[model samples]
Target: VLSEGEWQLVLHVWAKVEADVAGHGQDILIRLFKSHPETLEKFDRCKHLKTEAEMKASEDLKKHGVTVLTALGAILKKKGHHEAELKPLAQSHATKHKIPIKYLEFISEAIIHVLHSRHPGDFGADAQGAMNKALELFRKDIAAKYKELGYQG
Candidate 1:
């Protein structure tokens, strides 16, 4: 489980990712869990699990989650500026695992649900706007990473 400080960091990172690069939010979450296995238990027990159990389980897999997310981030970093490059990996993964798409949607929704539960009334209209600004900062950071890889997107 994450320490209080770590959880705070998770929330900060999560909120920032959710608001701007919503497209890569799941990948970011998967990466965070891979980088810090200890956080897995907390994430597993999260209220959103019921809604997104399969995706969460897929992420909990030893290295599979990281690998999948790494590919996903690469795809986004390379093709996000354009809409066509975004393929539905979630559906592909779900088909491979025999899980339903509703599960993935639920997981994403549940994440937002849990975040709201964690900070009721804080993520109001203004909070969403702040989240967008934070997300833009995150996007800039990720864009730099892409640049390091010689990716132009």
Candidate 2:
């Protein structure tokens, strides 16, 4: 039940995330949300529901979160062969769900909240290590999915 202004800010934040991960971005958001619904709840509540200034501030935090996750994904790809599988999953999910690229902007905002709650100290070294480990696990899971699909990579 966000006011129009608040909803607008949410949309703006989402847009930024979507822009950051267009080709395989939406899949990441969807997977993050589906795996962690509580994060979505936090985002729904915490997103600045008021003025432009508040929205801008929120967007700044979200941008950082996006950067962290993107970095984690890149590292995982470099560290493991199966990490590359996400690109295909993202493409397949987008096609199957007919999820619009624009909608990914909103998904990015949701992902920020999830990461913030799950890893509040994302800027710290320990948090970065944790993120790397989490990404490794995620890579494993994704690899399993590919295996199930008979993907050989």
Candidate 3:
């Protein structure tokens, strides 16, 4: 659970990211693929993309990336207690997308990495800690749903 101050701090930096949501969203995925290239295989939109230039130019990838970040934005807006909203999303990822629970772990780190690189001044130690805690809990919640849906691996 985040203190009021921590929550405020996160939202403050998030606002900057949200200002150019789609661009930042695409950057997050780009950063994710750069660090864990194999993870790209899981994304239908850009799985065939072979290089950084290709990934960056992918409109489908950008759309999905924005979808992901906006979902997180929604959860944050709800003050981090929207399991009701998250459940079906997780269900589809498990049943429809066939995404492993571990990908959630990778994406969480990618989100923070993108944020830190974009806002190095705003995302210092404290902000990084806050975002990490928030996303870790978010990942755990999603992983719980994944497990419930029989995606133990």
Candidate 4:
């Protein structure tokens, strides 16, 4: 569990990025897909996007990104748990999408990397540490759901 101070730092970071969830969210997905093209192939809408330009031009990709960030933003504001709040997404990924649990870590890291790069000055070690712990816990919860759904990594 994050201490009060850590939650404060996270909210500070969130306040900065909340305005352009679309931009930051898409950037995270772009970074993940670029580094690991296999993940991109998992998505029907974005699978054909070969280049950054192609990915950026994809309305589907942008819409998904926005959806991700919007959900995450709500979770962060409420200091929510993944099991309780993100269970549907986890279930869909397991049963419908069959997304490997390993890719979850990539997306988590992408979020941290994008945030740090976007705000090197504001996002110090404390903020990064807090965010890391939060995403790690989120990953663990999703992993557990994948296991419950019998979706092996």
Q: Score residue 52 of candidate 4 by CA lDDT.
A: 94
Off by over 4 Å in 2: 1-84, 124-153
3 against 4, candidate with superior TM-score:
3
TM-score of candidate 3 relative to the true fold: 0.92
Judging by TM-score against the true structure, name the best candidate.
3
Clashing pairs in 3: none
Give per-residue CA lDDT, model 2, range 33-147, as digits (tens): 4554433444444343344344334544456356545654453434343446565654453444333333433454445444444435432344334433444454455545545
Q: Which residue runs of candidate 1 sit more than 4 Å off their true CA positions?
A: 1-51, 56-114
Q: After superposition, how far is residue 60 of candidate 1 from its true place, in Å?
A: 1.0
In lDDT terms, which candidate is top? Answer: 3
Model 3 spans with C-alpha error above 4 angstroms = none
Higher-TM-score candidate among 2 and 4?
Answer: 4
Instruction: Tell me the whole-model lDDT of each prediction, alpha carbons only.
Output: 0.41, 0.44, 0.83, 0.82
Estimate, for each residue in 60-121, the C-alpha lDDT of model 3 and write its tens digit. 88898899888888887666777987898888888888877677778888888889888999
lDDT of 1 at 22: 36
Reference-based TM-score, model 4: 0.91
Assess candidate 1 and give its lDDT: 0.41
Q: Write the per-residue lDDT of candidate 4 for residues 47-132, one digit (tens) a residue.
A: 67888998788888888988988877767765645456778878888899888767888888899989999988879999999888
